[PDB]
């Protein structure tokens, strides 16, 4: 006699604010030269977005933070991961050392900091 | 005037809105010490792109199970969304502070936040650490005490507007508790 | 305070003649000699230790204990001398958790099962203050010690009727078992502690297997639920001449 | 067997089609809770002659009577006789979670069951006696996980509603 | 265990709120009809040894298999240890009258009696019956209407102490059934 | 019908065993590789019109005697009558693969094909090369090296699936052998 | 309980064989570094109070929800309970760091600790951290990378007393969890 | 079973900065050794390798010989690549202070690889002990035509560190 899908999706539309995952956000600026007519605050409305491509200075720094570490390698182990579904030819140069690997090595360029 | 901001949050839509120097010397001294307080705004919001990136990495300096595989900061993409939640926590920690009230807070962020992360997984125990970094940056950046990073302003104390948003931060941490 | 068990389907508890020979001048006590000596000390083996089996090569490091116990017949102080032993802690300290160590105290030197949270939680008060012989002397030196055993029987399982909690008879017949049952079985582990620090009780099946011989163990269960679900309220309604009255 | 597999194909070899969308999104629940009734049955399992014991006690404790002379327990070649009937169905309850459903309960010890328990004067209140003691006495971290004793204690209740 | 006072004081604990005049107007009538709860207990304990013998001989009349061979109130051993057993229960719940909450006969007296009832064989259906005989027995006191036993009281309600009684009669048979 | 779990219960039954230790691995290798079979029988079902006409007149070209006048599959009556005498075979066999046990194949297809195609004088060896072409077929849908259609799939080794599903249809060719 | 001398003979007690030469090495290594093993075990029981005191009060700043009111570490005797535990944790690991071997820290500290910690309901995320800050500050000393309080050791390797005792600290956190 | 450079394709750089760099330094006990560790190798990393190989021909010469494995230019040009990717991984392995990486992304498979090469396996143990007896030279600072200078203490634990790493690679091409 109830419709379920109906008086829940109801029921989860007024309790859960409309708001939540739309991302976006008050951005603030500030403006001022110094004179009393030069202070606007501009408190508008924007969505933020997932900024892609600096996470890559963040994701990669703190893989070879954590690599370095002699003591956070121990008391924070990592878990056994699984290589993909590359499958062994019989040849053992390209098995073991494939052309995604061939002939890739690390350098290490020290400097100041 | 100051409620008109308001409207443009509530409407979920790209709105603009702004004050005059006449009716921001009438808000500034209608509100008491109100030239401090848009020197606590433009404390953080000048250095807010640094310091979601130094707490993000900060909350894997201390934990690098984050990036494990099976982390909750990998696949490229989880990261990128990590730093786009600390960047909207920080937006609206410092309209709190510009507005000088919480009620904003609440509802248009921290409402319902604490189900969005069990729902996805996301471990709240490290997004606490990562806004106490950020709670820690933002009484050092309004005191005037950062190391690295000095901004000349006029003389005074500013340890009341601090403690306030120390606690608009622990509002934050409350939330997602 | 009558309790239908006790004294009709136990036996009578075991212990020295009287508790005026301490008063008498001329000894130290009724001299019981060593028929009527012996088969006492078996029952102290029998009580603090559970059935443990103690051999022969065990109870060459208890000499000095007994030795004492012939000539000063003090029950009290052989039972404190025998859990300050190696062979009380090699059984029930070493390799167990510490509430384990805990509700065996009170099985051991009590014949109780404790009743509390928070009496459980200031033994473990004296073990920060004083190891583990801060908990033995305090359990021996204490009122309820003194008002049921004294220094003249053992320490037995008391069916006493008027238990200060009904889950105190509960957790002493978990703690007991059969007479073909020592204390050892679990791999540490106590038994009776997620009913102590949740307010929840035991299982049916484990108490009436340590009942004794006359007292209907194990009838009475329905075959549905065991215990008590504390969110229902039951509609319970008298009647009245008129209708039926819900004083809820 | 009553299974997830058995019911998605038995319901479309009676219609005569091809296993479609919804028939393989059921496999992926046998796939979504094989971790929780799986550890359910190895801790059963490794731990079964010290359960049917308990249990068996559980019906000579309620009904201590069939222990008099003239009673299903009178002598000692039928007391043995109820614990291997009990070792029975709890194995039958470790078979139950290894498949999936309730095939191994019903193909082999609820089908018929009545017939042969009347038949012999066993009372069924005591099959019952055995396996609701069991279905109380067991907690939620420290026997198994919480969904692994979900899963347990449903088979369990499905043989109480069986037997009644 | 808790009384009337103390259950005020761990309902504002959950909130850290202080106990102010809104909640303390339920207090300031407790200790206004605080003479009714005295003039009421002792009409239930100068009575309490005939309200026992009543309630249990009173359920060997509607159920006089309780005493013939094979019953659980068949010999002296049985039937002694049925009324002391009815006996701790009317003294629990005289406990929890004079408190005004009743956390005394839950955790001491009901926490694990159905355990013991079906260890020791104890019938649950008639146990109930003398204790609502019982529950009979105490609001029949209370409100002077019984047919002996006249007692001598000041004039006006009791009508809400004969029924907060009534309810802590029937926790006993919610936690037994 | 057993599947790939109540398969080993019947193994351990005959023992009076439990299913747990050793017995217990090769089931949850069942499930780690559970993702892998459904994703090979939605591969079948999804080609099964192009399977089975592809296989009937793979049949047909290699003996044309069947179309000659008087044979097996001379008219439509009995040219629609084998399109759907192999497209039941076909749709007993993805049965099989579904739950991992041949116990679908064998008691609801293959008991009693012998006998049947005996009355109905149907070619054993026309048949069995019907059913062959299928296997090879399905050997080349479930490994992605089919020469007329590629499907999108996750990387990874699959030819213990293809070569579970070759035992099937030799038991179908046994049969009828 | 064990050591790791009492390891290698209840290993061989089991074979019925004496312990060799080439089961003698890893042993006659340990009585080589023994020196080394009891110069890092002091380093923890001289910082033990600060340590306990650290980790706990971190496990605050994490999670600031243990501290309102319906918290778990809310009021004073819940506080002092914590520092109570987190010393019994840093108690038994420093029994098995000087014993080399995890028996006794496994069965009278770990043994029904998950069963324990549930019925009382302390939350099993935040136990785990304050088992882990004090994991790395227990790496630290035997590193000797401390931030204050250098100590003044010998001078070689110490890494592998420092990852048997980052064994031990997650032997506590695959027990609670 | 390797280390927290998982990262395969997505930007392959990783630097660490400076203030990073004081989360790092006050983490490793010498730190200030470890650094100046591997800095006495890679600034020196094109002439261990060209001194690496022609010291294997110095004392094998008939591997310029026809037949031989290092006539025909690419494959001389071949082996002063795997000499150097040989240094090249354990110089991130002493700053690592573990072999993983070195041990499943370079040796892991490198002896099967050799035998289906060609590769003769006995002057490879030949040119790679050179290298250990190089670094544990430079680390020291006994390096006789070069001397670099640095601050006043012992580096000996270092230098059995990476004799140990040299003898990984010496074991995994056995
Ligand atoms: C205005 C609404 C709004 C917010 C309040 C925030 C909160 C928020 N974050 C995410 C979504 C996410 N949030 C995180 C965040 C984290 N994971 C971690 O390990 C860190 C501790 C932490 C921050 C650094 C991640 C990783 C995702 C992506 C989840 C995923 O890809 O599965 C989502 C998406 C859920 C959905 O769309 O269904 C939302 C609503 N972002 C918003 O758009
Ligand atoms: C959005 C635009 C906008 C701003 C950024 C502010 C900027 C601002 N604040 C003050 C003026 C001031 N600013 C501060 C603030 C501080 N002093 C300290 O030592 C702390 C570091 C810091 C507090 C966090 C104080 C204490 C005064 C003087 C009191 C006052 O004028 O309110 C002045 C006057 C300077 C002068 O004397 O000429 C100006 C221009 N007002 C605006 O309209
Ligand atoms: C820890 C302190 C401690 C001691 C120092 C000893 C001392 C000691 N010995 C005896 C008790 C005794 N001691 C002896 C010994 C002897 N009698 C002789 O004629 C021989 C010369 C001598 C042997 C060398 C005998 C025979 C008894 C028992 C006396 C009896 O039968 O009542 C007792 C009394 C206890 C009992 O009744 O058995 C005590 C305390 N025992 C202890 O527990
Ligand atoms: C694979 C599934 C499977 C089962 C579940 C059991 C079911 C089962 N149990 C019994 C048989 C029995 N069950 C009981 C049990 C009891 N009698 C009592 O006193 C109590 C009521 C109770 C103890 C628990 C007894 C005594 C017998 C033997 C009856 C007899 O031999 O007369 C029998 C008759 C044949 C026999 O003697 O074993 C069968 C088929 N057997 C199976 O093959
Ligand atoms: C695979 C089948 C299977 C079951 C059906 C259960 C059943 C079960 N429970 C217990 C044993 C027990 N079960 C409990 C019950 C609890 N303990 C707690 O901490 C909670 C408070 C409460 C659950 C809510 C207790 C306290 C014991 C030990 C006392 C006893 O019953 O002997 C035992 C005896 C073995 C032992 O010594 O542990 C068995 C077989 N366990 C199983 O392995
Ligand atoms: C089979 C045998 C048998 C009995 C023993 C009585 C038992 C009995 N007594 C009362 C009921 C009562 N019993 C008493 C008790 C007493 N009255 C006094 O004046 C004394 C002081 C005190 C001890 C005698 C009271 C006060 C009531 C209720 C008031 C009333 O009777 O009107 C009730 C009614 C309860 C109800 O309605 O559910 C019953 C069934 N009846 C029986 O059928
Ligand atoms: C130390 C022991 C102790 C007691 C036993 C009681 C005794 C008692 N009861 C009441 C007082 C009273 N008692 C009743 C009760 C009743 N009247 C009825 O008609 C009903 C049958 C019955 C209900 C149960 C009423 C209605 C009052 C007056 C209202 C009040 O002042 O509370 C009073 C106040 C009036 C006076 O002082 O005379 C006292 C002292 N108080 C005590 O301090
Ligand atoms: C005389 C007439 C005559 C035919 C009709 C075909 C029939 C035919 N097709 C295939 C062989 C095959 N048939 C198919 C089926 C298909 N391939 C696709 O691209 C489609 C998606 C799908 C149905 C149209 C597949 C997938 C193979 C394997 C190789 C491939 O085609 O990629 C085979 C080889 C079977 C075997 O190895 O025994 C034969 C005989 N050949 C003939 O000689
Ligand atoms: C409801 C319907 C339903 C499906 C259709 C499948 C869909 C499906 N396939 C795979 C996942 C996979 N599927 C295959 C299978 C193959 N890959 C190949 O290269 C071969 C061509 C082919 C047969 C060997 C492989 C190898 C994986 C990778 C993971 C694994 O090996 O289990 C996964 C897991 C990876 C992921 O989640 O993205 C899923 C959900 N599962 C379902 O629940
Ligand atoms: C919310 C508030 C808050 C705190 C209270 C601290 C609590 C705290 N301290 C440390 C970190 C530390 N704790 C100590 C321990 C001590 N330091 C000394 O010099 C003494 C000997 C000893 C007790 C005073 C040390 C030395 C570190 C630095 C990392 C380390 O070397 O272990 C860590 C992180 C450990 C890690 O993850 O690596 C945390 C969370 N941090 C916070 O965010
Ligand atoms: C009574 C208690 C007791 C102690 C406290 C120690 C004290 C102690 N430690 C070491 C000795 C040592 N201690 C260390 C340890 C270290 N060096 C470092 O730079 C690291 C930071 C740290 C690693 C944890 C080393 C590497 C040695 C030398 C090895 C050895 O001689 O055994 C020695 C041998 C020689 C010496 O250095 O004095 C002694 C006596 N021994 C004891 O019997
Ligand atoms: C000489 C100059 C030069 C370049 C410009 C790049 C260009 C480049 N990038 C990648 C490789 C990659 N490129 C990205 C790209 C991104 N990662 C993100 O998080 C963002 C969405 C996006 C940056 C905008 C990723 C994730 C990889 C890893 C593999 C892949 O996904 O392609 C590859 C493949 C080889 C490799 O994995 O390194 C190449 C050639 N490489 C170079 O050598
Ligand atoms: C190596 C491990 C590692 C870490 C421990 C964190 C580093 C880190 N820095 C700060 C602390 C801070 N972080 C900043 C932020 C900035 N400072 C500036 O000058 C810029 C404008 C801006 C982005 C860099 C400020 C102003 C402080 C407070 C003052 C200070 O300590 O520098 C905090 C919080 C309080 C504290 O513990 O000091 C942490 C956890 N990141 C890491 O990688
Ligand atoms: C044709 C025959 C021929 C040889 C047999 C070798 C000679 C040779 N020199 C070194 C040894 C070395 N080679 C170097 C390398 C260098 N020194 C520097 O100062 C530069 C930076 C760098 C490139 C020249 C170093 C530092 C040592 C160790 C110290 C030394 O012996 O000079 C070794 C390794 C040590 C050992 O003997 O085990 C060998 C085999 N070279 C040859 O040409």
Same mark, same amino acid.
């Given at each position: 006699?109830?419709?379920?899908?109906?008086?829940?999706?109801?029921?989860?539309?007024?309790?859960?604010?409309?708001?939540?995952?739309t991302?976006?956000?008050?951005?603030?600026?500030?403006?001022?030269?110094?004179?009393?007519?030069?202070?606007?605050?501009?408190?508008?409305?924007?969505?933020?977005?997932?900024?892609?491509?600096?996470?890559?200075?963040?994701?990669?720094?703190?893989?070879?933070?954590?690599?370095?570490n002699?003591?956070?390698?121990?008391?924070?182990?990592?878990?056994?991961?699984?290589?993909?579904?590359?499958?062994?030819?019989?040849?053992?140069?390209?098995?073991?050392?494939?052309?995604?690997?061939?002939?890739?090595?690390?350098?290490?360029?020290?400097?100041?900091? | 005037?100051?409620?008109?901001?308001?409207?443009?949050?509530?409407?979920?839509?790209?709105?603009?809105?702004?004050?005059?120097?006449?009716?921001?010397?009438?808000?500034?001294?209608?509100?008491?010490?109100?030239?401090?307080?848009?020197?606590?705004?433009?404390?953080?919001?000048?250095?807010?792109?640094?310091?979601?990136?130094?707490?993000?990495?900060?909350?894997?300096?201390?934990?690098?199970?984050?990036?494990?595989?099976?982390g909750?900061?990998?696949?490229?993409?989880?990261?990128?969304?990590?730093?786009?939640?600390?960047?909207?926590?920080?937006?609206?920690?410092?309209?709190?502070?510009?507005?000088?009230?919480?009620?904003?807070?609440?509802?248009?962020?921290?409402?319902?936040?604490?189900?969005?992360?069990?729902?996805?997984?996301?471990?709240?125990? %490290?997004?606490?650490?990562?806004?106490?970094?950020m709670?820690?940056?933002?009484?050092?950046?309004?005191?005037?005490?950062?190391?690295?990073?000095?901004?000349?302003?006029?003389?005074?104390?500013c340890?009341?507007?601090?403690?306030?948003?120390?606690?608009?931060?622990?509002?934050?941490? =409350?939330?997602?508790? | 305070?009558?309790?239908?068990?006790?004294?009709?389907?136990?036996?009578?508890?075991?212990?020295?003649?009287?508790?005026?020979?301490?008063?008498?001048?001329?000894?130290?006590?009724?001299?019981?000699?060593?028929?009527?000596?012996?088969?006492?000390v078996y029952?102290?083996?029998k009580?603090?230790?559970?059935?443990?089996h103690?051999?022969?090569?065990?109870?060459?490091?208890?000499?000095?204990?007994?030795?004492?116990?012939?000539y000063?017949?003090?029950?009290?102080?052989?039972?404190?001398?025998?859990?300050?032993?190696?062979?009380?802690?090699?059984?029930?300290?070493?390799?167990?958790?510490?509430?384990?160590?805990?509700?065996?105290?009170?099985?051991?030197?009590?014949?109780?099962?404790?009743?509390?949270?928070?009496?459980?939680?200031?033994?473990?008060?004296?073990?920060?203050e004083?190891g583990?012989?801060?908990?033995?002397?305090?359990?021996?030196?204490?009122?309820?010690?003194?008002?049921?055993?004294?220094?003249?029987?053992?320490?037995?399982?008391?069916?006493?009727?008027?238990?200060?909690?009904?889950?105190?008879?509960?957790?002493?017949?978990?703690?007991?078992?059969?007479?073909?049952?020592?204390?050892?079985?679990?791999?540490?582990?106590?038994?009776?502690?997620?009913?102590? =620090?949740?307010?929840?009780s035991?299982?049916?099946?484990?108490?009436?297997?340590?009942?004794?011989?006359?007292?209907?163990?194990?009838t009475?269960?329905?075959?549905?639920?065991?215990?008590?679900?504390?969110?229902?309220?039951?509609?319970?309604?008298?009647?009245?001449?008129?209708?039926?009255?819900? %004083?809820? | 067997?009553?299974?997830?597999?058995?019911?998605?194909?038995?319901?479309?070899?009676?219609?005569?089609?091809?296993?479609?969308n919804?028939?393989?999104?059921?496999?992926?629940?046998?796939?979504?809770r094989?971790?929780?009734?799986?550890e359910?049955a190895?801790?059963?399992?490794?731990?079964?002659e010290?359960?049917?014991?308990?249990?068996?006690?559980?019906?000579?404790?309620k009904?201590?009577?069939?222990?008099?002379?003239?009673?299903?327990?009178?002598?000692?070649?039928?007391?043995?006789?109820?614990?291997?009937?009990?070792?029975?169905?709890?194995?039958?309850?470790?078979?139950?979670?290894?498949?999936?459903?309730?095939?191994?309960?019903?193909?082999?010890?609820?089908?018929?069951?009545?017939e042969?328990?009347?038949?012999?004067?066993?009372?069924?209140?005591?099959?019952?006696?055995?396996?609701?003691?069991?279905?109380?006495?067991?907690?939620?971290?420290?026997?198994?996980?919480?969904?692994?004793?979900?899963?347990?204690?449903?088979?369990?209740?499905?043989?109480?509603?069986?037997?009644?």
């Amino acid at each position: 006699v109830v419709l379920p899908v109906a008086r829940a999706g109801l029921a989860a539309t007024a309790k859960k604010n409309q708001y939540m995952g739309t991302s976006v956000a008050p951005e603030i600026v500030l403006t001022d030269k110094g004179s009393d007519m030069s202070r606007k605050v501009k408190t508008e409305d924007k969505k933020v977005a997932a900024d892609q491509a600096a996470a890559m200075g963040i994701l990669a720094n703190m893989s070879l933070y954590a690599s370095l570490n002699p003591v956070k390698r121990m008391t924070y182990k990592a878990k056994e991961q699984a290589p993909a579904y590359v499958k062994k030819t019989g040849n053992p140069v390209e098995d073991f050392y494939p052309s995604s690997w061939r002939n890739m090595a690390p350098v290490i360029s020290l400097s100041a900091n | 005037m100051l409620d008109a901001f308001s409207r443009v949050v509530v409407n979920s839509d790209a709105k603009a809105a702004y004050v005059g120097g006449s009716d921001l010397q009438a808000l500034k001294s209608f509100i008491a010490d109100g030239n401090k307080r848009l020197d606590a705004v433009n404390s953080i919001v000048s250095n807010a792109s640094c310091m979601v990136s130094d707490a993000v990495s900060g909350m894997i300096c201390e934990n690098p199970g984050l990036i494990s595989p099976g982390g909750n900061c990998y696949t490229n993409r989880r990261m990128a969304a990590c730093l786009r939640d600390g960047e909207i926590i920080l937006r609206y920690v410092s309209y709190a502070l510009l507005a000088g009230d919480a009620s904003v807070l609440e509802d248009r962020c921290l409402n319902g936040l604490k189900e969005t992360y069990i729902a996805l997984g996301v471990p709240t125990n %490290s997004s606490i650490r990562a806004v106490s970094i950020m709670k820690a940056q933002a009484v050092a950046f309004i005191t005037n005490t950062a190391t690295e990073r000095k901004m000349s302003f006029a003389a005074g104390d500013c340890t009341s507007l601090a403690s306030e948003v120390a606690s608009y931060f622990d509002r934050v941490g =409350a939330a997602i508790s | 305070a009558f309790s239908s068990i006790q004294n009709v389907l136990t036996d009578a508890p075991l212990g020295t003649p009287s508790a005026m020979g301490f008063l008498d001048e001329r000894t130290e006590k009724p001299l019981m000699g060593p028929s009527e000596m012996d088969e006492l000390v078996y029952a102290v083996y029998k009580q603090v230790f559970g059935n443990a089996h103690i051999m022969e090569s065990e109870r060459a490091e208890l000499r000095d204990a007994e030795s004492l116990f012939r000539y000063l017949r003090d029950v009290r102080e052989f039972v404190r001398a025998l859990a300050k032993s190696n062979a009380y802690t090699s059984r029930f300290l070493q390799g167990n958790q510490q509430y384990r160590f805990f509700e065996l105290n009170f099985k051991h030197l009590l014949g109780r099962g404790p009743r509390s949270l928070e009496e459980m939680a200031s033994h473990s008060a004296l073990y920060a203050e004083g190891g583990f012989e801060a908990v033995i002397d305090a359990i021996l030196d204490s009122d309820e010690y003194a008002q049921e055993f004294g220094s003249t029987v053992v320490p037995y399982c008391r069916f006493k009727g008027e238990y200060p909690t009904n889950e105190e008879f509960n957790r002493m017949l978990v703690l007991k078992g059969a007479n073909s049952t020592s204390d050892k079985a679990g791999k540490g582990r106590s038994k009776l502690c997620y009913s102590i =620090a949740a307010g929840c009780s035991q299982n049916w099946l484990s108490m009436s297997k340590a009942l004794p011989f006359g007292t209907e163990k194990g009838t009475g269960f329905n075959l549905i639920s065991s215990s008590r679900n504390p969110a229902a309220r039951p509609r319970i309604g008298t009647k009245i001449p008129g209708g039926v009255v819900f %004083s809820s | 067997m009553k299974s997830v597999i058995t019911t998605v194909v038995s319901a479309a070899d009676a219609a005569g089609r091809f296993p479609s969308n919804s028939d393989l999104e059921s496999i992926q629940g046998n796939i979504q809770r094989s971790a929780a009734r799986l550890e359910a049955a190895e801790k059963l399992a490794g731990n079964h002659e010290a359960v049917v014991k308990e249990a068996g006690d559980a019906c000579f404790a309620k009904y201590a009577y069939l222990k008099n002379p003239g009673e299903a327990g009178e002598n000692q070649e039928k007391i043995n006789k109820c614990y291997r009937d009990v070792d029975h169905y709890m194995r039958l309850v470790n078979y139950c979670l290894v498949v999936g459903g309730t095939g191994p309960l019903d193909e082999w010890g609820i089908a018929g069951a009545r017939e042969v328990y009347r038949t012999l004067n066993l009372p069924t209140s005591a099959y019952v006696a055995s396996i609701a003691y069991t279905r109380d006495r067991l907690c939620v971290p420290r026997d198994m996980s919480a969904q692994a004793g979900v899963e347990f204690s449903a088979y369990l209740d499905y043989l109480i509603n069986a037997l009644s």
